[PDB]
Amino acid sequence: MIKSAFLPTGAFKADRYKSH
C-alpha cells in the first residue's frame, strides 16, 4: 500500500473549464 496524496489533473481544458 503506497502512502501518497492524489492531485486531480485537468487534461481536457482544466476539466470542462469555460474559457474567459
Helices (H), 1-20: 13-16
Amino acid 13 reads K
Query: Hey, what's the cell of 14?
Result: 482544466
User: Going by C-beta distance under 8 Å and a sequence separation of 6 or more, which residues neighbour residue 8?
Assistant: 15
Other C-beta atoms lying within 10 Å of the C-beta of residue 17:
9
DSSP character for 12? T
Closest CA to 17 of 7, 3, 4, 9: 9
Experimental approach was NMR
